[model samples]
Target: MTKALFFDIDGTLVSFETHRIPSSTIEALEAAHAKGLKIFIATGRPKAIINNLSELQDRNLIDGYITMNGAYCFVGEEVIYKSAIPQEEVKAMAAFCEKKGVPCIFVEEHNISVCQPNEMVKKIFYDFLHVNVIPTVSFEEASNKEVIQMTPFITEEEEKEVLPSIPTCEIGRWYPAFADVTAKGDTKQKGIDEIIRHFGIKLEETMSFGDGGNDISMLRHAAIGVAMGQAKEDVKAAADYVTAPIDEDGISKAMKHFGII
Candidate 1:
């Protein structure tokens, strides 16, 4: 039996159109949780602003979280694994992006601060994703604190320039307008490994669902990876199965296909 299920939030569990988890998907997850299967969230989202899952949290259906694109993983109030980008690298990237007039959002242990939030930032993170970006401090101040993830709004060519300055970090650009940077080698696959070890579960008993560029490693590494119908071609190729779109009951359908719910 599959003992654990990991789901990505945006575009996999929650719909971009409605900014809410489809009722059918929630029912599917609740059913799986009721069946003694563990449910967890694996998203590029930071721990601070994961505002969309109050329904699941209220019911205690979620067991853990793999946030910041796997740079940070936790179960309940305890941390399983945590990785932060080097301070120097964080500073360098901040300086570079500032000079380029590019906006960057710095994610720390508990705060998400923005450097230069342009119209695109507002459109993507606020309008499109519906994230409540509570900027705690200036980006420079937050970079000095402890950065686990950094999202820089830059094109592909500019990404090349930004990468060299922060060699200790890597990029997972789920959006074409920006790139997400985290410590190198920290990924969703690593988060799964860490979380499973903590729960005494094996890789063979885990299932995952996702639909983004950052979800690639987790999709490829899980025992059964189910990609959402709206996922990009690259993400789908990394998964073992593809299900309906998020608003179309993708999670529930995939769970049914796998006999998990």
Candidate 2:
């Protein structure tokens, strides 16, 4: 059995309450690896954001990274898969956000550039994500280069307008005012599916843990999806089992329950 396990970032592997990985989580991951299980990170965050994770900085600990909601995936220096938004779609969405005065950020392989670095944008990028939002004026030009993910800060009412503006993409949201847009049909499950093909892992031998809207698809797709106790109802409903909250040794509890730790 390949026995690969995937985990979501943010509210899943990293706790918002403590802004850290719980001690039990560290133990669970270390133990899981000691058993020779492949551990991976599947999250909407790009490489830039994931690099700042102190708990995971050892690099040798993770088998692979599925970033940008599965649009960009890599294992060490080897890129296993990548997909970018069409230049036209990128240009169109950036224009729409700018015209509407909606603060938006674009993510590429290695950089996160912001169209507007307003206070709220800074708060989300710096305080919550612990990353810098590099300011860029010509997103249309940046679009020519490429875009893997786009996030726009707009109310749900504005979401309707913004969502339809990019017909080739779908929104995966974790908050009320901002949402991440990835290609239509792109989910963490897509990345995991690729990992399965590349590693000869069977679907039935895999497990996953997550706790948010973007994680819903992966949670439902894994053989044994574990949802954190405080996950959204839809996310929890999609999971095969529900574990303790992130602050309450959720990963450790779930891994133990599944006999993976």
Candidate 3:
């Protein structure tokens, strides 16, 4: 039986359209808990940004969280492990974006402000995710703080130029329009291992669900990696199993297939 389960946020647990967990999925989560299984959230978004999920707000359901693509991992309210991208690397990346006239964001532990937010930024964070951004902050002011993550709002062509400056960072992108940046060598797989260590959960007793390129590492790390049916070809190819799309009750069905619910 699977003892620990990890899930990606958008397009996995929550529908990309409604940004809400399906009732069937909610039931499945509750059912898993009834069986004494542990559930966790693994996502690219920071903890502050991930909190907008009202489903989680309503229940103390989740056991842990791997946010910022593993730059931050926490069990309940206690952070088990965390690391931040070097200020110098973050500083240089910001300068590059300024020179290229690109709009980017600086992600600290508690704050995620933009460089020069425009309608597009608003659309992506607000319209897409229903997340409201705070006022823009300069890198000079942010330099003193620890930057755990960064989102380079640049096209593929621009990505080539932007990434070279931060050689100590890793990149992952579920969306084609932008890339998720984290401190180099940080990945959800590392976070999972940490979880296993702290919880004493066997590697073979763990499973995961996801539907994006960023999920590949985590999917491969688990004993069973179930990719959403709508996941990209590469993401699906990397998984041990493929289930129905989010809107089609994927999480619940996957749980059933594995005899979890």
Candidate 4:
């Protein structure tokens, strides 16, 4: 029997637009938990934000979380692993973004994500993010804070320009309009590997789900990597299995296929 399962939050367990988990998916999670199968969240989102998602908490689906593209690994309140971006890189990237007029957000370790001080930023967030997006402080204020990741929003051209400048940083693009920069060696695969070892499980017994370019490595690495049907063609093409769109209870369907439910 598969001892553990890893799920992606944005487009795997919940709807990207609605930010709600389907009932079928919830049922599947509950069944898996009852069967003594461990369930964890593997997503690009920060841990703080994942906690606020109703399905994750309400249904108690996640036993641990691999957040910020695997910079952090936590089981309940205990941190199994943690990583952060260097202060100097954070400062340099902030200055570079300021020069290019690119909007950015700083994800402080165990704190709220701080967005740019622009009305457009708020508007874009309110349009896309289903949960509350609160403004805490500025990028300059984040210099002193322990940052887990830096997500800078820029145009395609600007992304190309800024990414090369931070060659030392591990950068990934999840949303079509945003790029995330984090410390080297901190990736979803790393986080998943740590979690698997923590539970003394094998890689071939673990399954992962995702739908973006950033998820490519995780999909390729997992024993049963599922790609969302609505994902980009290239992303879907890389998966071991393809499921229905998030709205059609893709996660639930996948779980049933594996007898998790």
Number of the top TM-score candidate: 1
Query: Which residue pairs of candidate 3 clash?
Result: none
After superposition, which runs of candidate 3 have C-alpha atoms over 4 Å from their true positions? none
Model 4 — TM-score against the truth? 0.91
lDDT of 2 by residue, 142-188 (tens): 55657888888877788777666688886787655578888767789
Per-model tally of clashing residue pairs? 0, 0, 0, 0
Cand. 1 TM to true fold: 0.95
* Per-residue lDDT over 124-165 for candidate 1, one digit per residue giving the tens place of the 0 to 100 score: 988787778657456568668788898888898998887778
Clash count, candidate 1: 0
In model 2, which regions exceed 4 Å deviation? none
Write the residue-wise lDDT of candidate 4 on 27-100 in tens digits. Answer: 88888899988888887888656643675577676788888888888887888988888778888778777777
lDDT of 3 by residue, 120-167 (tens): 677777788777665688756655567898887888787777666788
Q: Once model 2 is optimally superposed onto the true structure by TM-score, how far is the C-alpha of residue 49 displaced, in angstroms?
A: 1.5
For each candidate in the order shown, give its overall lDDT on alpha carbons. 0.87, 0.81, 0.84, 0.78
lDDT of 2 at 241: 95
In order of lDDT, best first, we have 1, 3, 2, 4
Off by over 4 Å in 4: 113-115
lDDT (C-alpha) at residue 101 in model 1: 90
Estimate the overall C-alpha local distance difference test score of candidate 2: 0.81
